[PDB]
């Protein structure tokens, strides 16, 4: 038996979403006291009035906020043994594969968070290769909805296909019976284009989730509900605690079959042009964040109503839905069939809050700690090593701490082809 050191390469991963996501590193000393959460403001919107006499009509000031927190470390704790030889020849390769797997986990977490908190939903009644230019139509629908909603896109937009839909788009381009530059590139290579239908970054991500269909049916809103924008509220002790602006809990008839990531739309409500508060022709879409209780659900776009008479003008200035819930509205489930999801967003909607692990400290004497940077993704964790007692072996840990957050759930989106019947 002549075991060699010629390795057979088997796997090769890409992390485009994790590479593109913005990385935020708040100060650790403050974060430890603040309990791994930090609040950031939201662009203020101002109400306006018409008329000459405005006595006793002077509004207040309302400035909303969102909160970003973190999760738990993703380790690769493994054990060494210095008296073997297979445990010697494989330790370095284990380290490298550990770095690669950590990058994989970060990208998967980003993709799952985006696909489960993407408020905007663009659905199609058939596949992409059915008719001509359907891939471009799918991208242009997302571009048009983000343009109509007047969402900020200065930092850039992004659309991630799944490989099957990427192949379908390339096939649509190459069945054109003409050859210029775009078909020629889509033939020689697999790329459709770098920019399609307005998006300045159209990529293909092999690690996009599948949104399983929803078994929910015949669900209606129970009781008229109005969710007023607010910046803080009084607790039992009288302290003013902040309120997140990306969550609203509604009371439905029954949350049977609903799950994290289900896309819904109430029958009757519509979108608004945000700044101008003009009613759009497309029904409002929401994504359920958490199925609390058996009759409540937490949806990520807070449905502020324009005609809500219970809203002070400074709160009505944040309206994003043309009408409020009316005790009988049926909620239509938008994901009626299983389908792998294309995910689009504005590049400033998803961030990765990262905190260090100060294991290089004096308190952890006897263990040797090093900085350890993940490639591709822009993250740095710790690599710690300790030795066992009375034996030539030890433990090695590759730890790294991150939390993926969606600061603007209304800016993220999802693409669902073939959502028929």
């Amino acid at each position: 038996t002549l075991a060699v050191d010629e390795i057979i390469e088997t796997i090769s991963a890409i992390t485009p979403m994790a590479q593109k996501a913005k990385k935020y590193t708040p100060p650790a000393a403050s974060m430890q006291r603040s309990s791994n959460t930090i609040w950031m403001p939201v662009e203020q919107e101002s109400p306006t009035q018409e008329g000459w006499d405005l006595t006793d009509k002077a509004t207040g000031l309302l400035e909303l906020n969102v909160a970003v927190n973190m999760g738990e470390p993703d380790n690769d704790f493994f054990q060494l043994r210095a008296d073997d030889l297979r445990d010697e020849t494989a330790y370095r390769r284990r380290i490298q594969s550990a770095a690669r797997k950590l990058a994989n986990n970060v990208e998967l977490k980003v993709a799952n968070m985006a696909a489960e908190m993407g408020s905007l939903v663009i659905t199609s009644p058939d596949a992409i290769g059915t008719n001509t230019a359907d891939a471009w139509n799918f991208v242009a629908d997302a571009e048009e909805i983000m343009f109509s909603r007047e969402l900020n896109r200065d930092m850039g937009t992004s659309y991630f296909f799944n490989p099957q839909d990427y192949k379908k788009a390339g096939y649509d381009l190459t069945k054109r019976d003409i050859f210029g530059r775009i078909p020629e590139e889509a033939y020689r290579d697999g790329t459709i284009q770098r920019q399609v239908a307005g998006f300045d970054d159209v990529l293909r991500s092999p690690k996009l989730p599948v949104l399983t269909k929803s078994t929910a049916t015949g669900i209606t809103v129970s009781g008229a509900q109005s969710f007023k924008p607010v910046a803080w509220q009084l607790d039992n002790d009288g302290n003013k605690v902040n309120v997140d602006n990306r969550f609203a809990t509604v009371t439905l008839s029954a949350t049977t079959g609903m799950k994290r990531g289900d896309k819904i739309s109430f029958a009757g409500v519509k979108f608004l042009g945000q700044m101008a508060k003009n009613v759009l022709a497309q029904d409002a879409t929401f994504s359920v964040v958490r199925v609390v209780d058996g009759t409540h659900v937490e949806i990520t776009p807070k449905p502020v109503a324009l005609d809500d008479v219970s809203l002070s003008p400074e709160q009505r200035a944040y309206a994003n839905v043309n009408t409020s819930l009316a005790d009988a509205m049926a909620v239509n489930i938008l994901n009626v069939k299983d389908a792998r999801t294309n995910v689009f967003w504005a590049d400033d909607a998803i961030r990765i809050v990262s905190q260090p692990i100060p294991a290089n400290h004096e308190l952890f004497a006897g263990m040797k700690t090093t900085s350890f940077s993940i490639p591709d993704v822009g993250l740095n964790g710790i690599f710690a090593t300790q030795g066992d007692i009375s034996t030539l072996s030890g433990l090695c840990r590759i730890a790294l701490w991150y939390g993926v957050n969606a600061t603007r759930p209304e800016a993220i989106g999802v693409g669902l082809p073939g959502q028929t019947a």
């Binding site: 990385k23 590193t25 100060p27 650790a28 000393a29 260090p356 100060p358 290089n360 400290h361 004096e362 004497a365 006897g366 040797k368 700690t369 090093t370 900085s371 350890f372 940077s373 490639p375 822009g378 740095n380 030795g387 007692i389 009375s390």
Partner: protein
Amino acid sequence: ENRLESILSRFDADWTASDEARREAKNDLFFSRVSQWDDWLSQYTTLQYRGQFDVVRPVVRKLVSEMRQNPIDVLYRPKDGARPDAADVLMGMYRTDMRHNTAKIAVNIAVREQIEAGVGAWRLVTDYEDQSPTSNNQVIRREPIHSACSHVIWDSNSKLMDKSDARHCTVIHSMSQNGWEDFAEKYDLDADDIPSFQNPNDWVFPWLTQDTIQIAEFYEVVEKKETAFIYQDPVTGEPVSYFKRDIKDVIDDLADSGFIKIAERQIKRRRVYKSIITCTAVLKDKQLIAGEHIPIVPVFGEWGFVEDKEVYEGVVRLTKDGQRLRNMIMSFNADIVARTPKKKPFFWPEQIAGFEHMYDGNDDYPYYLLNRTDENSGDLPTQPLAYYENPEVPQANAYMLEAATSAVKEVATLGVETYVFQDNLATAMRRDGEIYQSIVNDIYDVPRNVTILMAEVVDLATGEKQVLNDIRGRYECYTDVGPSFQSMKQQNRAEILELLGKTPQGTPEYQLLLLQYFTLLDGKGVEMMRDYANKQLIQMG
């Protein structure tokens, strides 16, 4: 896109690339300075004798003394076709700001670490001095770096002994609480935000290093084409060129004083930036420092590349196995000597029953009496007296103590002489001279010599600050290696004596003797004698 992310990625790549040699060098340093029983599992098990019978330290001391007896210092020499004394001013500056104790200490530390571990380093910095400035109210000083193997991390993609082609280098600073407070005061940082950086310790190091703060300095070199202005000197000549970065201010003061612009060209040059970093945030981002090179000089022993992987070795690495074997065998022999029953007789209790006080050790009896009879066996059985065998040193133990000592003696012979190490030190000093020349051209006031006097052409801004003006005829002298002289007066005395040693006893010998008397120090009698020599030279014309 994150600057800290890029910096940390480069640092991680370099650290991982250089981990093996760094671990070996740290082990060598511990072996040669703390103890040769570098066992971190000894504190757990039971205690046995562990001696230290050194056979490598005398060789290290001999090599250090040999390298100390032959100092090496930079020697600036004018280029081919340049002015004959184009290096006098640079030599004066170099000697003036390198004659201090810090430079000698740093070089000695680097050399000792080169001999013991395999790599050492030192640093060049500039400071504002108001009492005794070298030039332009500034001084240049050479500071030491301790444990350069673990504290200086070079760019991994560098294939030169002096690391002249490396673009970046991160240096880990460790300081006490008071040191960090003063460092923050000096660098205008926040002393309340305690910084931390990686600095792993060996598993065998038993001490804690309580209350220390670690940071990193990241030096990077960027070569770019920057704009340069061509002026006309009102004093003398015509062509002078300066850099826009250097004359960002006093851009109209030149015109006011009498400089008229001729043209504007683009000249490529190097700029060095320093960043103060911790594991979390970037404290200082892009502080531009003086010079065209990283101010860090590394010195190597046996240096090379094996498989795109750097390896450096000193004099301790190859003797470690033999020394450890010798220590182990000597500990075994001492254990044998101590815990071993001595040579005493084997006695039946009935043999000496009643006579036990005769064999205790006194000498009050003429002989020893033994019992003869047993009431049941009639007479005691006859057996020759037996004695416990004396302790012995095994032939294997003696043979391998000798063999280990001989092997260490064979392998701990640098060269035949330390000529290779002295040549490596000379290369390091040449790099030091290069860096110092660049820093001098950047900050000092270098006069230009005319054949018609030294013309120091400088000007001051409206904020009373003085800005240097240096023409592009600056690299007029190259670098070589010569003896360490405290000043050019000593250098001239040595040169005159060297010329006297070869000049035969004639008129040149008389001239050289008079010159040596002229360049002497001052007292009273020697002052009179130097005056006489001056008068004789003047009279001879």
